[PDB]
């Protein structure tokens, strides 16, 4: 799961560690299992989430 | 450069002008024919394909006749390639005869050595025997196979096996005489191979 | 640099073309070119040049000194040219000149032959003197150290080929 998430996030301008920090600073609690499942099936949902993380650590 | 294919007839003797006796080897070479010309644009290098020794026609097949047809000859028994010869100067159909060489003409000579079969380390490699008396049980054997530490035998440990039958060339021999109406060259010394076996003669590489 | 700061002022005939790196001094004999570096730059107001240095480099001065020395040499030579003179001690030795063929006779069981490239010449007046003449400072020096290399000088009688000012030390070989 972690390697698939890294692969997907680097396509949205992030890396794995910065995106995990961003999701924690926003209070999102998705598994790494559902995150990878989204990364392969629903790219638009994965981008919604990556934008929320990018705005969280923009402070 | 210069080079021809022939067959081995045998050895004889001859006296010179001054009156010295000299051992010799007769080689017979009826005219060789150029069958193909290889170039860089087509093949990637430069060479010449030569044939020797006409063959009866029940003994060849249709692909061979097609290959020999563009040169207007009978099917051949021996086909070799001759390299490092300024192409030009050559074309399919030409005949190379023994007057390509003249007396003098230090030359190289190649053949395939006689066959001898399964032979031991003493005849095959020049290894020495063990003692024949004095309580000995070690006459005609190949030696110790190595030391203990590597737990195996190294490569090029030499042993028994099939001897002879390899190709060998001998360098810097002399042409003693050339006879044109008979297609014969006389070479000073001995050559490798048996009688009726294929022989190749080229001008020498070390000049 | 004290060398890097000094002045090069070009006598008559000099033209100095610029193209990126290359410089090409020309004069009344030759038209030498040499590749120089970026971090030291050209100059204006003909019949004078200085070079300059953006500081803060570690060594702070080396590249500067060489980049000026070489240009001063090119000018000094393209207007004037350089000279190297070789002597000959060692009784029985002689040189002779035939175009670009320098023939030498030094104790050997064969004469020795040297040939000079484009920019260079030879000048043998006598069986003792040789003179190497060119524009380059490097090539003339290399060719003279080539010639003197055929037979350096011994110390017990000082025979052999020497630069025309070499100070050789002399030993006392006993008489047996």
């Amino acid at each position: 799961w972690i390697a698939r998430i890294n692969a997907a996030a680097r396509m949205n301008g992030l890396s794995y560690s910065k995106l995990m920090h961003g999701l924690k600073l926003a209070e999102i609690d998705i598994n790494r299992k559902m995150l990878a499942d989204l990364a392969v099936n629903d790219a638009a949902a994965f981008t919604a989430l990556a934008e929320q993380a990018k705005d969280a650590l923009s402070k | 450069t210069k080079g021809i294919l022939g067959k081995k007839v045998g050895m004889t003797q001859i006296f010179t002008e001054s009156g010295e006796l000299i051992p010799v080897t007769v080689v017979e070479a009826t005219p060789n024919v150029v069958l193909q010309v290889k170039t860089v644009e087509t093949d990637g290098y430069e060479a010449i394909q030569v044939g020797y020794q006409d063959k009866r026609e029940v003994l060849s097949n249709k692909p061979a006749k097609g290959h020999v047809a563009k040169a207007n000859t009978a099917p051949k028994r021996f086909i070799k390639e001759f390299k490092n010869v300024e192409l030009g100067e050559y074309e399919v159909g030409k005949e190379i005869k023994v007057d390509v060489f003249q007396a003098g003409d230090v030359v190289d000579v190649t053949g395939t050595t006689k066959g001898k079969g399964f032979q031991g380390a003493i005849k095959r490699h020049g290894q020495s025997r063990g003692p024949m008396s004095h309580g000995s049980r070690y006459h005609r054997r190949p030696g110790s196979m190595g030391p203990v530490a590597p737990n195996r035998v190294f490569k090029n440990k030499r042993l028994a096996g099939r001897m002879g039958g390899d190709r060998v060339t001998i360098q810097n021999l002399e042409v003693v005489k050339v006879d044109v109406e008979r297609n014969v060259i006389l070479i000073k010394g001995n050559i490798p191979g048996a009688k009726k076996s294929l022989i190749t003669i080229k001008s020498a590489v070390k000049a | 640099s004290r060398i890097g700061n000094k002045v090069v002022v070009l006598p008559a005939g000099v033209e100095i073309k610029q193209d990126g790196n290359n410089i090409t001094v020309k004069g009344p004999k030759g038209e030498l070119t040499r590749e120089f570096s970026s971090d030291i730059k050209m100059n204006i107001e003909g019949n004078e040049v200085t070079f300059t240095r953006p500081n803060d480099s570690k060594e702070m001065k080396t590249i500067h000194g060489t980049t000026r020395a070489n240009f001063n040499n090119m000018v000094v030579g393209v207007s004037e040219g350089f000279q190297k003179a070789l002597e000959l001690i060692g009784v029985g030795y002689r040189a002779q000149v035939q175009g670009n063929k320098l023939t030498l006779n030094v104790g050997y069981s064969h004469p020795v032959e040297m040939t000079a490239p484009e920019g260079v010449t030879f000048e043998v007046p006598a069986n003792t003197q040789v003179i190497v003449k060119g524009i380059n400072k490097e090539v003339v020096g290399e060719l003279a150290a080539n010639i003197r290399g055929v037979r350096p000088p011994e110390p017990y009688k000082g025979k052999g080929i020497r630069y025309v000012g070499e100070f050789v030390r002399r030993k006392e070989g006993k008489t047996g």
Binding site: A3, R4, A7, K33, D37, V40 | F154, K155, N156 | -
Partner: protein, 145 residues
């Protein structure tokens, strides 16, 4: 034993790429090429399947070596005959036979089993600016790493 995707043999498309090797140090270029051949940049990555892309490396003659590697880094080989080490090579490979160079660097950064050996047959390396593979329509990759 539940739902995580796993890819199949001929299901995930493989694209062709062109990478340019003038002034990139040997190992940095080689690390990036090695990750692209294994498919690590695609979320469909599964380890018992091959999903990497193909890579063309161009201008291998101008690859960079820092320090004194061009004279002091040496490649050894043994012929398995007694006393038969061959230490013949140095940064002479970069002059003559610069494909050997790139290939032996990339080969040591891939797994050592039958999948990693089959992923090595997608590298095509060229000493000059031109490749013979224009019918596969390859896209340019740009390195900054």
């Amino acid at each position: 034993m539940r739902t995580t995707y796993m890819a199949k043999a001929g299901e995930v498309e493989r694209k062709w790429y062109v990478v340019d090797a003038t002034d990139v140090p040997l190992g940095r270029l080689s690390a990036v090429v090695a990750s692209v051949l294994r498919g690590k940049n695609k979320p469909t990555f599964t380890p018992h399947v091959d999903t990497g892309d193909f890579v063309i490396v161009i201008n291998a003659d101008k690859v960079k070596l820092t320090g004194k590697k061009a004279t002091d880094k040496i490649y050894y080989r043994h012929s398995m005959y007694p006393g038969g080490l061959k230490s013949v090579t140095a940064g002479e490979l970069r002059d003559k036979n610069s494909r050997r160079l790139i290939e032996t660097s990339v080969k040591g950064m891939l797994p050592k089993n039958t999948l990693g050996r089959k992923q090595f047959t997608k590298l095509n390396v060229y000493g000059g600016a031109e490749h013979p593979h224009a019918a596969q329509q390859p896209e340019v990759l740009d390195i900054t790493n």
